[PDB]
């Protein structure tokens, strides 16, 4: 049971990290946008 | 007790004196004060 | 048959306030184990809050720990026992810290690294053999509390939030020169980093 | 009947409080609160803010507590009159 | 562990069989015309054999326990791995929730 | 392991060994160095070729056994317990127990320790050790420590350790520090007068 | 204070190693086995005293940066029959690699060398080691060794202060409860 | 029937334990 659960957890973590990575790239794009917006209230 | 040192000042830079509900001793919390002077002042306060 | 006082569902609640399936038996057993773990967590927290000296002393009334990490905020760590604003990050950190403290005894490190020794802290053994310094690589050699670490983490989170909001306002209010911020990918529980840039609207290249 | 029932329930409350105090001393407080004197059915004295890091809180049962479970008595200090706090 | 399962099955089967045999034999005993003479003797033999077999099987199975028996209740548990995995799953669920909320806000933006 | 240098500075003059230590404390206050605790060194001697054991407070649980030019074993404190107990096949030598006890002053990443090798009950001499924890490589800080000693100590600044004399890029080590302590002890003993 | 080590020694044939290990893991604290390889060298001083001081130095060949261990174990203190354990004075000191040269320059002369391969389990204070002694083939050749005998060696040991003895009673009870799979008894070193 | 001396698998050899302890002590057949 231990091996199974550990593998499951690790796979989950890998997926999570890659997500963190993808979400971070999206965040970078948005941070480069919103900040550069003309707007000027 | 938030007692201020100087008249023109904000929330920080004022002596925050607390009382431990379990012990009763006085504990002072200054932002940038060194820990040795802090415990010395704590002892001097708890004495009198 | 669930043991008494382990019945119902319990979940520790940590909040920051700017004021003042399958097998049935499995569910019962897991709920009781989680209740026991949360009870141990809160017992350790209350003991460290009461019997350990620290700045800005804290208040424990029945099952709630009210602390002032900063002079202008309140941290409430209260155990909620149902007996039939929540920051899950701090609860997860509490659970992992308690599990680490539990694993400390079963730690593989402290288990006679060499052979026929005394079975204790092989890092400290190597430090004593290699003549380590008084405080450097010794001093306390891990001697903190769950409450202290949790408070430090909460303070860091608040500071980060504060800086973020401040820059946002600066970005919304002041629009003439520019403002930019690129938060780092990897952070820590007691640290973070940004990259502020102040360019112009049209001349990005030269105004660097 | 009322006198007997009242005496019994007040004595039961007395140690329901004594048991709670010893449980608090065991787990959380840890010598931060102490038991000065406990008389079963007469009074129970709890001391807080000890001299190390004194005051007592007595849970008396005297004569007839006609008005209420004998209003508690903070014997040593007799705290000052704070309208909001002394009522609680 | 299917070995233990098969053992139990055989046990139950043999027991039921022997009980039925005894029933039939006593029914033929009260019978006014016991036509099953040799048949009855065969049944008796079978029942005896069954009981002997059951006894032997039981003794062997009991030893099986003694070989692993020690009285000690055994400490080693999977509590560590289980707790870790539970924590991980809860964390992933929280992440999914946050992602869904952000997606919903983006949908709202598009809806105007 | 941070490059270190130890030398004997004459207490000299009519200034009492202890008063000379007070003058050294005044010089350390002038540097702005602040006390960071206390340090105690004690030694055990065994006539046999030649066995010396030096232990320094800064390293709390280690006991160093040095065999002259032969290798130094850095071992846990139990080592002292064991040598004492076995004793029968160990030379008792004499009361050569040499100890230097003095304050530790920390100046920006340099720890300076000035102490009086008190022989037995009577003080005689003075040992100064400047340790640079950031500098793990010997020779690179043989130069740094000579410069720092010329800066404070001024006159009577030494010529640097024998391991410093040896030309290697090898990391310095608490071992060489114990070696220096040993040579220092040897110097007061032979010095006599 | 001095450290006394309680030792109960018994043997297991290899064909029962599997079963023994299984039972051991099941009863012992929830850990994986540590799989330890240790090379031990014995050095003796031929002093004026008839008895020669014997110091054993062990280096882990399976791990990196693990300090050599010097252990001194004196004469047995066994007296009463109501303990069933070898109580001996134990001094254990972690040491640097130069230890070999230090000891030979100090006079200590190397005696024999035996590598040991086996598993380590701990139950509370108690530590159970099932190991096999491989008589080194060629003292220089740690690589080549000779299994001394087919049977592995099971040792149950508790090293505690002399005043403590409840732990030794616990060790005796635990060995007795391991009797159905295998027998651990106090065997005198003599013959 | 009847019953004889049949312990289920004997895994202990006393002569082997004695030899092992003696070797650990006097280094027999180890040099």
């Amino acid at each position: 049971r231990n091996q199974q659960l550990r593998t499951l957890q690790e796979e989950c973590d890998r997926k999570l990290i890659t997500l963190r990575d993808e979400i971070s790239i999206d965040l970078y794009e948005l941070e480069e946008e919103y900040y550069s917006s003309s707007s000027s209230l | 007790l938030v007692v201020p040192i100087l008249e023109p000042c904000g929330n920080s830079e004022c002596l925050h004196i607390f009382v431990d509900l379990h012990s009763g001793m006085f504990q002072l919390m200054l932002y940038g004060l060194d820990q040795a002077t802090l415990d010395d002042m704590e002892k001097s306060v708890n004495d009198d | 048959q669930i043991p008494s006082d382990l019945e119902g569902s319990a979940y520790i609640k940590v909040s920051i306030q700017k004021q003042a399936g399958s097998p049935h038996w499995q569910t019962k057993l897991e709920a009781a184990q989680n209740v026991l773990l949360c009870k141990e967590i809160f017992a350790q927290l209350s003991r460290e809050a009461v019997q350990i000296k620290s700045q800005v002393p804290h208040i424990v009334v029945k099952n709630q720990i009210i602390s002032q990490p900063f002079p202008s905020l309140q941290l409430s760590i209260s155990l909620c026992h149902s007996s039939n604003d929540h920051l899950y990050v701090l609860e997860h950190n509490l659970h992992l810290l308690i599990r680490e403290f539990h694993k400390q005894t079963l730690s593989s490190i402290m288990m006679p690294h060499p052979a026929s020794a005394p079975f204790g802290h092989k890092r400290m053994r190597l430090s004593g053999p290699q003549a380590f310094d008084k405080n450097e690589i010794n001093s306390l050699q891990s001697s903190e509390g769950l409450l202290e670490k949790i408070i430090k983490q909460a303070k860091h989170i608040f500071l980060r939030s504060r800086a973020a909001a401040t820059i946002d306002s600066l970005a919304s209010r002041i629009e003439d020169p520019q403002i930019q911020a690129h938060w780092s990918n990897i952070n820590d529980v007691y640290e973070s980093s940004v990259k502020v840039l102040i360019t112009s609207q049209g001349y990005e290249q030269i105004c660097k | 009947m009322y006198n007997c029932l009242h005496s019994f329930c007040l004595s039961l409350q007395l140690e329901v409080l004594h048991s709670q105090t010893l449980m608090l001393i065991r787990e959380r407080w840890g010598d931060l609160v102490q038991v000065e004197r406990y008389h079963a059915g007469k009074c129970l004295s709890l001391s807080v803010w000890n001299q190390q890091v004194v005051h007592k809180v007595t849970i008396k049962i005297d004569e007839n507590d006609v008005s209420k479970p004998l209003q508690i008595f903070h014997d040593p200090p007799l705290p000052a009159s704070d309208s909001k706090l002394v009522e609680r | 562990l299917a070995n233990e399962r098969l053992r139990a099955l055989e046990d139950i089967e043999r027991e039921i069989g022997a009980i039925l045999q005894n029933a039939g034999t006593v029914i033929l005993e009260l019978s006014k015309e016991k036509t099953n003479e040799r048949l009855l003797d065969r049944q008796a033999a079978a029942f005896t054999a069954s009981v002997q077999h059951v006894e032997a099987e039981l003794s062997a199975q009991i030893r099986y326990l003694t070989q692993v028996a020690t009285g000690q209740p055994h400490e080693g548990s999977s509590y560590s791995s289980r707790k870790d995995c539970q924590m991980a799953l809860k964390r992933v669920d929280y992440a999914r929730l946050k992602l869904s909320d952000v997606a919903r806000t983006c949908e709202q933006m598009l809806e105007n | 392991m941070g490059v270190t240098c130890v030398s004997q500075m004459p207490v000299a003059e009519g200034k009492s060994v202890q008063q000379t230590v007070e003058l050294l404390t005044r010089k350390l206050e002038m540097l702005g160095a602040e006390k960071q605790g206390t340090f105690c060194v004690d030694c055990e001697t065994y006539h046999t070729k030649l066995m010396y054991v030096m232990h320094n407070s800064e390293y709390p649980l280690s006991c160093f056994a040095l065999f002259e030019n032969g290798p130094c074993l850095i071992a846990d404190t139990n080592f002292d317990v064991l040598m004492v107990k076995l004793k029968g096949f160990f030379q008792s030598a004499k009361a050569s127990k040499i100890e230097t006890r003095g304050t530790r002053y920390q100046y920006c990443d340099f720890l300076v320790k000035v102490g009086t090798v008190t022989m037995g009950p009577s003080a005689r001499g003075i040992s100064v050790e400047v340790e640079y924890g950031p500098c793990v490589v010997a020779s690179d800080c043989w130069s740094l420590l000579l410069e720092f000693l010329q800066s404070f100590l001024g006159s009577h600044t030494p010529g640097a350790p024998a391991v410093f004399g040896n030309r290697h890029d090898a990391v310095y080590g608490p071992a060489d520090t114990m070696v220096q302590y040993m040579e220092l002890f040897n110097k007061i003993r032979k010095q006599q007068q | 204070i001095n450290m006394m080590e309680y030792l109960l020694q018994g043997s297991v044939l290899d064909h029962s190693l599997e079963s023994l290990i299984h039972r051991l893991r099941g009863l012992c604290d929830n850990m994986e086995p540590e799989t330890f390889l240790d090379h031990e060298m014995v050095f003796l001083l031929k002093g004026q005293q008839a008895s020669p001081f014997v110091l054993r130095a062990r280096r882990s060949m399976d791990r990196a940066g693990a300090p050599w261990h010097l252990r001194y174990l004196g004469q047995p203190e066994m007296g009463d029959k109501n303990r069933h354990a070898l109580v001996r004075n134990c001094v254990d000191i972690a040491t640097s690699e130069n230890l070999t040269d230090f000891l030979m320059e100090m006079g200590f002369r190397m005696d024999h060398e035996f590598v040991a391969k086996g598993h380590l389990f701990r139950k509370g204070i108690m530590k159970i080691m099932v190991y096999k002694i491989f008589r080194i083939l060629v003292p220089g050749n740690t690589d080549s060794t000779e299994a001394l005998s087919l049977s592995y060696l099971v040792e149950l040991s508790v090293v505690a202060p002399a005043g403590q003895d409840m732990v030794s009673d616990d060790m005796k009870n635990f060995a007795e409860q391991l009797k159905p799979l295998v027998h651990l008894e106090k065997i005198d070193p003599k013959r | 029937e009847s019953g004889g001396l049949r312990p289920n698998k004997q895994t202990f050899n006393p002569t082997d334990t004695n030899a092992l302890v003696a070797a650990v002590a006097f280094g027999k057949g180890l040099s």
Side-chain angles (χ1 to χ4, degrees), chain F residues 9-169:
Chain F
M9 207 284 170
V11 283
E13 228 233 48
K15 284 312 168 290
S16 82
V17 41
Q18 308 172 358
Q19 238 292 129
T20 317
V21 169
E22 175 63 35
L23 258 285
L24 256 302
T25 78
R26 167 207 315 266
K27 297 163 193 179
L28 263 300
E29 293 152 10
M30 172 188 310
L31 288 181
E34 33 86 26
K35 297 182 180 181
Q36 284 273 358
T38 50
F39 97 93
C40 299
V41 172
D42 50 317
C43 174
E44 292 183 352
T45 56
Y46 306 90
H47 182 92
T48 301
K49 338 174 189 303
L50 291 160
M51 256 223 63
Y52 311 99
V53 186
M54 326 292 184
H55 14 285
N56 47 2
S57 175
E58 52 178 2
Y59 309 144
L61 293 178
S62 38
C63 278
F64 310 76
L66 326 309
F67 238 110
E68 344 136 17
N69 316 7
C72 333
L73 245 201
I74 326 179
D76 296 355
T77 31
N78 224 358
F79 195 72
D80 265 2
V81 175
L82 179 87
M83 306 334 272
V84 167
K85 177 153 296 182
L86 346 167
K87 72 153 51 188
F89 304 89
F90 300 93
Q91 290 297 179
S92 95
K94 259 297 296 175
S96 308
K97 328 282 138 284
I98 21 210
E99 309 183 359
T100 68
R101 315 212 157 209
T103 36
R104 331 185 330 141
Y105 291 102
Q106 191 188 54
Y107 175 71
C108 193
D109 296 357
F110 291 86
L111 268 159
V112 204
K113 294 183 330 272
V114 189
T116 79
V117 165
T118 67
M119 192 317 289
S122 75
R124 37 174 51 190
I126 248 185
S127 68
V128 183
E129 174 155 15
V130 215
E131 101 87 10
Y132 198 61
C135 221
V136 71
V137 42
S139 296
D140 296 23
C141 278
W142 115 238
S143 93
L144 156 61
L145 263 337
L146 217 283
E147 177 267 345
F148 196 77
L149 281 152
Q150 205 66 44
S151 176
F152 79 109
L153 210 61
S155 63
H156 294 274
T157 279
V163 280
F164 284 31
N166 160 250
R167 257 65 263 267
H168 224 285
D169 295 354

Side-chain angles (χ1 to χ4, degrees), chain A residues 28 31-32 35, chain C residues 167 179-185 187 192-199:
Chain A
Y28 189 107
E31 232 135 22
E32 195 116 63
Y35 287 123
Chain C
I167 292 226
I179 208 175
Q180 290 203 211
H182 304 311
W183 291 76
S184 195
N185 282 17
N187 309 334
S192 174
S193 88
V194 311
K195 290 180 74 68
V196 190
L197 285 90
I198 309 173
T199 44

